[PDB]
Design a protein around this ligand. Structure first.
Ligand SMILES: CC(C)CCC[C@@H](C)[C@H]1CC[C@H]2[C@@H]3CC=C4C[C@@H](OC(=O)CCC(=O)O)CC[C@]4(C)[C@H]3CC[C@]12C
Ligand SMILES: CC(C)CCC[C@@H](C)[C@H]1CC[C@H]2[C@@H]3CC=C4C[C@@H](O)CC[C@]4(C)[C@H]3CC[C@]12C
Ligand SMILES: [Cl-]
Ligand code: NA
Ligand code: NA
Lengths: 219, 536, 214
């Protein structure tokens, strides 16, 4: 029925500008107030701006007032948020939330669109294979790894054997350390599976036209 | 801006419930039930109340609170092409008080005349009686009761007036009582809401005290239940008739008194986020609830007259000023401890009228204050000059033919004028302004949009409701005649001018405003149909 | 700004048990204006409870809400593993609209020792001036775990990158990757590298080590 997708997003230099958009579907968009509410990477939900059903009543937060501007296109059913004079404290996932009646809260939420704001530059990762130490005990279970170091920005997609290996896989979240992200994943497979059947980690970084396969081979 | 606000939400509730409940709650609603199928009359009365009355009542309270301005400003602030609606409405309220204050005066005269051991209106052997005097009400015209003769030969002296041309001498005892009414209103409205919302604590709450002590008194009389039978015995054959549906429709509309700028005035002083929806439903219910109770206060003793006094129910079940000024006092004259029931009854009438008149004259001063700031700054000076004009020409209602004057204005000056005004009120907010705009406005105030039921009522059934009422008022029209007196044709023509003078302000202002802004035609309507708030 | 704090910040609980979490406004809010939002890991929030106590469409009757004024609470009658999420209270009473600090709900579980795996830097990273030794500690409970890197017996503290995974939805365990990064030079000047895991499941640490020769 009702649906909300958020468009735009990406990374911007501090002081830059960007405009996000929310395509509303499955309901009469013109008779529902809309609102933008973000949450930072530290998972803090924070309401940004509300626009009335007719765009004639608009409220902002103190942290974005003047910089941000909200608008409606009830012809094509699009909710917009124009951001200017961006600071680093504005990097967050941005949610487009339907919420007319205040007493009944925010009915439906979008998927969210993500915004980054840094002076840091875009970097593609150098993905490494992680084979076990040389000539050790089988143990009926062997853990292979895949190191994805020094990229920017988020996100990256890591998957094993084109996504056919979804059991015994642990993809760890990326840690930002001095303007670079490092990520790692681990797969445990039975000793009769490797290296008899080869294992590969598929790293993809669309922010830098990156699509790298990497085989896990012993030494 | 920083507009004045009520010094308490109950001050607003009391002064609205006060304004809403009046003499049409006691001397019209119970008759209708009796005349139109007893308790079965509540079916069309309630449906007409839910789909036609409460919608219009709710709508004006929102526009008052949302636009934070008086009558003429709000409509100019809302749709400038129809800014004349504020003027016409204020003119109607300006006309009403020229005569409908005399009911509070007659009530104060009976109050003054009740400080006696035996009330005067009980005996047929006074200097003001005729040989045709009867102890109680009958059905032949030439023979009236002792209370009818007392009212029409001592208090009114209407027997000394040949008609509207013959106003005759001026009863100075009545001119004093009308002066007292305008004194009661002044030192309760000159300082504004500070005192208005507080003086109404007495005028709006007292009638419930009186209705209580008069309900236990009426329900414990010999023959009370017989009236409750007449008042409520259901005869569902009425519901089929169209006239009773219009009786229910027209009573529902006027008993809430919309389209008079008063609700628009009182609500404008509310906080912007007050739950005006909750206030509309609460106050409107208490209006009909007070009417439901009053019918027992009336028809209990109305049956007591048929039982112990031997009177046809048809000869005493009346409506209007006849019910409160001849028949009910005649029944009080017979019950033990008579003088007490008279005083609590007659100041029930006064406290019923004052709180209602408050809103009408308040609708004037708020609207005029919000438009002419040098009289917003001189309220106690301005409102001291308004009642001055009221007392001058109001001397016509104290002349020996003053009732002929009162009855003429009652049946012309404000009836039809307020129907076409609300009809343009209803379509200006629904079509020109837009339900989408109006719903979006009160969502900002109360947090939720009005239901689809509320705006489907504001958009389609509200004009049909007012059209239904106007059609039935015009269908049953006749030239004006009171008792055996037929008014001259020029007197009827005078009443239509009073009717048109207000409502002509809609097209006259619409004309004067249209050809006073530049541009093309469609380039001008978008000027006169863009609201003040939309253009900031 | 009506700041709303929530307690506890993160609570674990066994299935079948009951949980209560509170939401403390700094200024009184009307009952009809406080709402609750459940947000599962890697997903957008969802309206869970509106007007203190009214359940949204879909949320089961084992959830309930109560409170008034400055103190509010969310309660789950009998917790299930499908309720492992973060719960946010929100006030719609006045602008600015504000969301609570959030209460993370996790599932209690029997303890579990971590399976430690050490990895030397691959030959690809070694060509460039780089050398990162990675240590995996997978499928353990509770979440707290500690690592020490020993380079030839003497612990090395600086230059590591730790990452904790979310609580698994199968075995409800955790997993932590630690990555010590060296230059190719200072790496090739040391022969034995060690990764010790100090967990609650053992007095002594589960140590894994290797030598740059093999
Ligand atoms: C004679 C006296 C003593 C009693 C008169 C009865 C009225 C007071 C009752 C009877 C029918 C009731 C009405 C029936 C229907 C409605 C529609 C109803 O609309 C809704 O259900 C809410 C819509 C929404 O916002 O979602 C609001 C109450 C209302 C106006 C009620 C208001 C009070 C009414 C007029
Ligand atoms: C006539 C007898 C039998 C019953 C009369 C009913 C009276 C007692 C009822 C009906 C309307 C009521 C009032 C309606 C509204 C309000 C405003 C509210 O915010 C405070 C109480 C107050 C002022 C109520 C006091 C009691 C009240 C006056
Ligand atoms: Cl009524
Ligand atoms: Na009244
Ligand atoms: Na009335």
């Amino acid at each position: 029925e009702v649906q909300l997708v958020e468009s735009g997003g990406g990374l911007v230099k501090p002081g830059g500008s960007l405009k996000l958009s929310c395509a509303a579907s499955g309901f009469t968009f013109s008779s529902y107030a809309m609102s933008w509410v973000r949450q930072s990477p530290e998972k803090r939900l924070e309401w940004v701006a509300e626009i009335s059903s007719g765009g004639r009543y608009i409220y902002y937060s103190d942290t974005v007032t003047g910089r941000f501007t909200i608008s409606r296109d009830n012809a094509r059913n699009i909710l917009h948020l124009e951001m200017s004079s961006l600071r680093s404290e504005d990097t967050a996932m941005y949610y487009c939330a339907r919420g007319e009646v205040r007493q009944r809260g925010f009915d439906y939420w979008g998927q969210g669109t993500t915004l980054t704001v840094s002076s840091a530059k875009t970097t593609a990762p150098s993905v490494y294979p992680l084979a076990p130490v040389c000539g050790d005990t089988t143990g009926s279970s062997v853990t292979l790894g895949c190191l994805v170091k020094g990229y920017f920005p988020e996100p990256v997609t890591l998957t094993w054997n084109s996504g056919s290996l979804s059991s015994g896989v642990h993809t760890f979240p990326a840690v930002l350390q001095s303007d670079l992200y490092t990520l790692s994943s681990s797969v445990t497979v039975t000793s009769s599976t490797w290296p008899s059947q080869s294992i590969t980690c598929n790293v993809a970084h669309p922010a830098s036209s990156t699509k790298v396969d990497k085989k896990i081979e012993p030494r | 801006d920083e507009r004045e606000t009520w010094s308490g939400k109950v001050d607003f509730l009391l002064s609205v419930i006060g304004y809403a409940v009046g003499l049409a709650n006691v001397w019209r609603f119970p008759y209708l039930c009796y005349k139109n199928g007893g308790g079965a009359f509540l079916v069309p009365y309630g449906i007409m109340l839910a789909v036609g009355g409460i919608p219009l009542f709710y709508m004006e309270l929102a526009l008052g609170q949302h636009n934070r301005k008086g009558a003429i400003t709000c409509w100019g602030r809302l749709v400038p092409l129809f800014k004349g609606i504020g003027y016409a409405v204020v003119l109607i309220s300006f006309y009403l008080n020229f005569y409908y204050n005399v009911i509070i005066a007659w009530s104060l005269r009976f109050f003054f005349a009740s400080f006696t051991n035996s009330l005067p209106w009980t005996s047929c052997n006074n200097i003001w009686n005729t040989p045709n005097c009867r102890p109680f009400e009958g059905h032949v015209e030439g023979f009236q009761s002792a209370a009818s003769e007392y009212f029409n030969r001592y208090i009114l002296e209407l027997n000394r007036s040949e008609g509207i041309h013959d106003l005759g001498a001026i009863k100075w005892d009545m001119a004093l009582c009308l002066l007292i009414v305008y004194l009661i209103c002044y030192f309760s409205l000159w300082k504004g809401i500070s005192t208005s919302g507080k003086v109404v604590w007495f005028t709006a709450l007292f009638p419930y005290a009186a209705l209580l002590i008069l309900l236990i008194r009426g329900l414990t009389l010999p023959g009370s239940f017989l009236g409750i039978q007449y008042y409520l015995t259901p005869n569902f054959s009425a519901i089929y008739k169209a006239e009773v549906w219009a009786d229910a429709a027209t009573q529902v509309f006027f008993s809430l008194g919309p389209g008079l700028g008063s609700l628009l005035a009182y609500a404008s002083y509310n906080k912007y986020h007050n739950n005006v929806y909750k206030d509309a439903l609460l106050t409107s219910f208490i209006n009909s609830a007070t009417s439901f109770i009053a019918g027992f206060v009336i028809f209990s003793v109305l049956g007591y007259m048929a039982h112990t006094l031997g009177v046809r129910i048809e000869d005493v079940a009346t409506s209007g000023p006849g019910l409160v000024f001849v028949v009910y006092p005649a029944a009080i004259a017979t019950m033990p401890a008579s003088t007490f029931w008279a005083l609590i009854f007659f100041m029930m009438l006064a406290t019923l009228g004052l709180d209602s008149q408050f809103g009408t004259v308040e609708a004037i001063i708020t609207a005029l204050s919000d438009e002419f700031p040098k009289i917003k700054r001189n309220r106690e000076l301005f409102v001291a000059g308004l009642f001055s004009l009221y007392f001058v020409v109001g001397l016509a209602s104290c002349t020996q033919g003053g009732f002929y004057f009162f009855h003429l204005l009652d049946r012309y000056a404000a009836g039809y004028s307020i129907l076409v005004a609300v009809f343009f009120e209803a379509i200006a907010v629904s079509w020109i302004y837009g339900t989408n705009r109006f719903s979006e406005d009160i969502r900002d105030m109360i947090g939720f949009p009005p239901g689809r039921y509320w705006q489907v009522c504001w958009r389609f059934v509200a004009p049909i409701f007012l059209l239904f009422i106007t059609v039935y008022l015009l269908i049953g029209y006749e030239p004006l005649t009171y008792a055996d007196y037929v008014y001259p044709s020029w007197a009827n023509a005078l009443g239509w001018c009073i009717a048109g003078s207000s409502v002509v302000m809609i097209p006259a202002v619409a004309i004067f405003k249209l050809l006073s802004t530049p541009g093309s035609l469609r380039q001008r309507f978008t000027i006169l149909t863009t609201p003040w708030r939309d253009q900031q | 700004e009506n700041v709303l704090t929530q307690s506890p910040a993160i609570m674990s609980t066994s299935p079948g048990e009951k949980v209560t979490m509170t939401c403390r406004a700094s200024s009184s809010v009307g009952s009809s204006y406080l709402h609750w939002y459940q947000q599962k890991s890697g997903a957008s929030p969802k309206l869970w409870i509106y007007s203190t106590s009214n359940l949204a469409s879909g949320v089961p009757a084992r959830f309930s809400g109560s409170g008034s004024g400055t103190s509010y609470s969310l309660t789950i009658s009998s917790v299930e593993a499908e309720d492992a999420a973060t719960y946010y209270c929100q006030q719609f009473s006045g602008y600015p609209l504000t969301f609570g600090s959030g209460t993370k709900l996790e599932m209690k579980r029997a303890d579990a020792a971590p399976t430690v795996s050490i990895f030397p830097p691959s030959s690809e990273q070694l060509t460039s001036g780089g050398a990162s030794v990675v240590c995996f500690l997978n499928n353990f409970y509770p979440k707290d775990i500690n690592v020490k890197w020993k380079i030839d017996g003497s612990e090395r503290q600086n230059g590591v990158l730790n990452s904790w995974t979310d609580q698994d939805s199968k075995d409800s365990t955790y997993s932590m990757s630690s990555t010590l990064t060296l230059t190719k030079d200072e790496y090739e000047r040391h022969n034995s590298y060690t990764c010790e895991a100090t967990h609650k499941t053992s007095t002594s640490p589960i140590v894994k080590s290797f030598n740059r020769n093999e």
